[PDB]
Amino acid sequence: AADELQQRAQGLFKPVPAKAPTLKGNPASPVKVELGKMLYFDPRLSASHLISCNTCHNVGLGGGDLQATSTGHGWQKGPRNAPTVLNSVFNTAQFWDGRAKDLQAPVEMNNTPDQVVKTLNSIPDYVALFKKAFPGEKDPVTFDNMAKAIEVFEATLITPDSPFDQYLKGKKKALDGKQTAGLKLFLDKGCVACHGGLNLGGTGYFPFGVVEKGRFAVTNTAKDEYVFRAPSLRNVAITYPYFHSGVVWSLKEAVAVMGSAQFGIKLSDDESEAIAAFLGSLTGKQPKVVYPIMPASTDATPRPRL
Amino acid sequence: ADELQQRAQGLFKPVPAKAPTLKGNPASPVKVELGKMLYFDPRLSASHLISCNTCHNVGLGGGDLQATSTGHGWQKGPRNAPTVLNSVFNTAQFWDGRAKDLAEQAKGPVQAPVEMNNTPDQVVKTLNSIPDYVALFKKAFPGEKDPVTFDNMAKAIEVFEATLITPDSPFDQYLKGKKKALDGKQTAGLKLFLDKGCVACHGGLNLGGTGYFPFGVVEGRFAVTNTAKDEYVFRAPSLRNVAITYPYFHSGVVWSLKEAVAVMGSAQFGIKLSDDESEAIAAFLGSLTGKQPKVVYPIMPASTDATPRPRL
Numbered sequence A: 001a002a003d004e005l006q007q008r009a010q011g012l013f014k015p016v017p018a019k020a021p022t023l024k025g026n027p028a029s030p031v032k033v034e035l036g037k038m039l040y041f042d043p044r045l046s047a048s049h050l051i052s053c054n055t056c057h058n059v060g061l062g063g064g065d066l067q068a069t070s071t072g073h074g075w076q077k078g079p080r081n082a083p084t085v086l087n088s089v090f091n092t093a094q095f096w097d098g099r100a101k102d103l104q105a106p107v108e109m110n111n112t113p114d115q116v117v118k119t120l121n122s123i124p125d126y127v128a129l130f131k132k133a134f135p136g137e138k139d140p141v142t143f144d145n146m147a148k149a150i151e152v153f154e155a156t157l158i159t160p161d162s163p164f165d166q167y168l169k170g171k172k173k174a175l176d177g178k179q180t181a182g183l184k185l186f187l188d189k190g191c192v193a194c195h196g197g198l199n200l201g202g203t204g205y206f207p208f209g210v211v212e213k214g215r216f217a218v219t220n221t222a223k224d225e226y227v228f229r230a231p232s233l234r235n236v237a238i239t240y241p242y243f244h245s246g247v248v249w250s251l252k253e254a255v256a257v258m259g260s261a262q263f264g265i266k267l268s269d270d271e272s273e274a275i276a277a278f279l280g281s282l283t284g285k286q287p288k289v290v291y292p293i294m295p296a297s298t299d300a301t302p303r304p305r306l
Numbered sequence B: 001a002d003e004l005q006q007r008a009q010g011l012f013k014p015v016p017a018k019a020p021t022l023k024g025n026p027a028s029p030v031k032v033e034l035g036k037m038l039y040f041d042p043r044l045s046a047s048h049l050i051s052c053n054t055c056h057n058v059g060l061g062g063g064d065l066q067a068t069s070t071g072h073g074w075q076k077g078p079r080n081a082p083t084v085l086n087s088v089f090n091t092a093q094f095w096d097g098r099a100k101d102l103a104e105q106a107k108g109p110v111q112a113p114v115e116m117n118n119t120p121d122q123v124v125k126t127l128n129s130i131p132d133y134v135a136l137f138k139k140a141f142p143g144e145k146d147p148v149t150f151d152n153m154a155k156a157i158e159v160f161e162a163t164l165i166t167p168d169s170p171f172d173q174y175l176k177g178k179k180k181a182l183d184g185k186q187t188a189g190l191k192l193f194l195d196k197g198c199v200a201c202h203g204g205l206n207l208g209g210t211g212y213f214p215f216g217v218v219e220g221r222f223a224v225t226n227t228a229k230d231e232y233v234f235r236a237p238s239l240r241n242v243a244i245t246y247p248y249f250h251s252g253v254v255w256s257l258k259e260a261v262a263v264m265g266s267a268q269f270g271i272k273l274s275d276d277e278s279e280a281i282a283a284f285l286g287s288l289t290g291k292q293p294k295v296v297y298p299i300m301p302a303s304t305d306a307t308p309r310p311r312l
């Protein structure tokens, strides 16, 4: 049975690779990764000059922000929980939720693409880096190239060698007894249908979201032609709170919510606990990032707008 | 040329290559690492959104790019954030205050209650709620029954800050003997810096940071005013890295370094500066930008069920 379980898991999931994956139409180079890193930490991408990507997707805090939903410009609370940047490169479901038929600069940073490009153009070192990272382009300082540089840096923010990955690679005892029982439940209860593959989710939209009605529960939104991403569960133990709205702080409680009659699933307290223990095995090696030294503004650089 | 380098070599000292030793606060690897984790941990703030790095950003010259800092609740504060870089060498802990208040100050720990909106007890509670922090404090502060205290927190942060120094600026290399580390304009600027009396208040190892004087910049839109009649004083800041710690003065009212220099060419000091002289001095001030610290971003431990929730 232990052998059977491991083989079953090996046919449903894959481990995080050791190296950054290659991105569609966006190749990595050392200078582009360094540029992307600088941009990711540079709060001058925001109108206020106070907020960077790292503010909400904090590389030292599991790639998130420790918040129910993110706070942005003006202390405005946003509508959604910031998903982790960690392993985000492997996801294909770009948004938390939206209309199934319906499915840019961050609004919470309060800057237009042209304002961002103006800011980058005002700093010669950035212009020079853009020329090195996107060579043979007349004017490489475009919002799309900025995004590409950030994305190659994000591709490096992956977390290999979690206990579950070591289990997938062959080591049964990478998971303890409780975690192993949790894995069996995760498969038998059908969690893997929506939270499977390389990233244990992040690839599918489903007409189910968590709402306040055991205080929270899954509701069926197909009648509304509305869907939610089933998130990647990698590093879930360190990306609390949970769900699109950040309404549940306990991982065990989040699992219990997912033990929903909407899925034909029932979970005892012990079962939810075992599954939560298993989800703890998905915490990988956190990225080692040298904090970027970002270049000085000049007299041409826009002033902060608060 | 040789007389200028020699007199400079007597009035200033270069930034050391090693972090200075802090009395009663030994740097150990684990204490430095802990200090770093704390410096970047926004759970030191009530909101869990603001860390020391938010306002003293290691990648932005140790400051925040703002006229005055924006803290908890998007509240604009009264003062410009001074750089963390080389702050270890300073003695004047405040931008300004009453002379009777700032006289006989003793060095105390960082308290940022308005900025971060946490009390010392709330901070200690937060740290005690995370086993990895408790364990790190025990390693960094051996032989103490309960090492998780506000003072030890501050000590750990202080040993980390001691590493945030910027050696090998062109001026420092000039001090160490390389005349051509400064170009012609910067060299002209240095002579002016000495001759015009700037060094009187912006002298020594950090080119300032050690004295309070009864002069502050108030609303060529800004000028120095004499505040002795009001028994009030202002810090003469360390000018190290000044080219990258704009905007300038206590209120962050002047964005141009040349203009800041021109304001400091004040009749209040008996100093007169031509425009060319202010440009020359500003060029010299640019030579004070040192090597920026290379910091591996800390991986900070997960909160637990005991950890206070964000208070926005």
Ligand code: HEM
Pocket: A040, A045, A051, A052, A053, A054, A055, A056, A057, A070, A071, A072, A073, A078, A080, A081, A082, A083, A084, A085, A088, A091, A093, A094, A095, A096, A097, A106, A108, A109, A150, A154, A202
């Ligand atoms: C340019 C800087 C930023 C970058 C590169 C970035 C990156 C990302 C990524 C990769 C995702 C989706 C992850 C996935 O597909 O698995 C995302 C979504 C999100 N980010 Fe950011 N982010 C940035 C700035 C911010 C800031 C400053 C905030 C907080 C104020 C924030 C909050 C969010 C939120 C709430 C979502 C979920 C949006 C939704 O699906 O409705 N982001 N971001």
Ligand code: HEM
Pocket: A186, A189, A190, A191, A192, A193, A194, A195, A206, A208, A209, A210, A211, A228, A229, A230, A231, A232, A233, A236, A239, A241, A242, A243, A244, A245, A254, A255, A258, A259, A263, A265, A275
């Ligand atoms: C007991 C089995 C399951 C477990 C343990 C489980 C686990 C979880 C967890 C921990 C989250 C929160 C992730 C985060 O916030 O980053 C989540 C969210 C989600 N899961 Fe599951 N899941 C299970 C079954 C399913 C199934 C079968 C589906 C698809 C039909 C699914 C779809 C989703 C969706 C759409 C969300 C986002 C909901 C929202 O944010 O409102 N889950 N799941």
Ligand code: HEM
Pocket: B039, B044, B050, B051, B052, B053, B054, B055, B056, B069, B070, B071, B072, B077, B079, B080, B081, B082, B083, B084, B087, B088, B090, B092, B093, B094, B095, B096, B110, B112, B115, B116, B157, B209
């Ligand atoms: C615990 C984290 C923090 C640490 C360790 C820290 C460190 C320091 C240091 C060392 C100084 C004086 C510099 C010197 O002595 O040369 C200072 C002053 C100052 N910092 Fe911070 N700081 C922290 C948090 C913050 C935050 C979050 C903000 C912004 C909201 C901020 C804004 C300021 C301002 C405005 C001053 C000048 C205060 C005055 O003199 O009136 N600090 N800080």
Ligand code: HEM
Pocket: B193, B196, B197, B198, B199, B200, B201, B202, B213, B215, B216, B217, B218, B234, B235, B236, B237, B238, B239, B242, B245, B247, B248, B249, B250, B251, B260, B261, B264, B265, B266, B269, B271, B273, B281
């Ligand atoms: C032309 C000669 C001088 C030059 C080039 C010069 C340069 C500067 C610069 C660049 C600043 C802004 C530093 C910052 O914001 O980080 C400053 C501030 C200051 N300097 Fe000078 N300085 C000169 C003469 C003096 C003298 C003689 C004194 C003392 C009597 C002095 C005391 C101060 C004080 C108190 C401040 C802070 C004022 C405020 O923030 O309102 N300076 N100086």
Ligand SMILES: O=C([O-])C(=O)[O-]
Pocket: A050, A051, A055, A071, A072, A073, A075, B049, B050, B054, B070, B071, B072, B074
């Ligand atoms: O820096 C801030 O004030 C923030 O994150 O909102």
Ligand SMILES: O=C([O-])C(=O)[O-]
Pocket: A240, A249, A250, A251, B302, B303, B304, B305, B307
């Ligand atoms: O901090 C929490 O609430 C957690 O880890 O579940």
Ligand SMILES: O=C([O-])C(=O)[O-]
Pocket: A296, A297, A298, A299, A301, B246, B255, B256, B257
């Ligand atoms: O950005 C500025 O204004 C500067 O460098 O003086």
Ligand SMILES: O=C([O-])C(=O)[O-]
Pocket: B044, B045, B110, B111, B112, B113, B116, B117, B118, B119, B120, B123
């Ligand atoms: O963390 C601190 O030092 C504070 O909040 O005063």
Ligand SMILES: [Ca+2]
Pocket: A064, A081, A082, A083, A239, A240, A241, A242, A243, A246
């Ligand atoms: Ca979350």
Ligand SMILES: [Ca+2]
Pocket: B063, B080, B081, B082, B245, B246, B247, B248, B249, B252
């Ligand atoms: Ca400043």
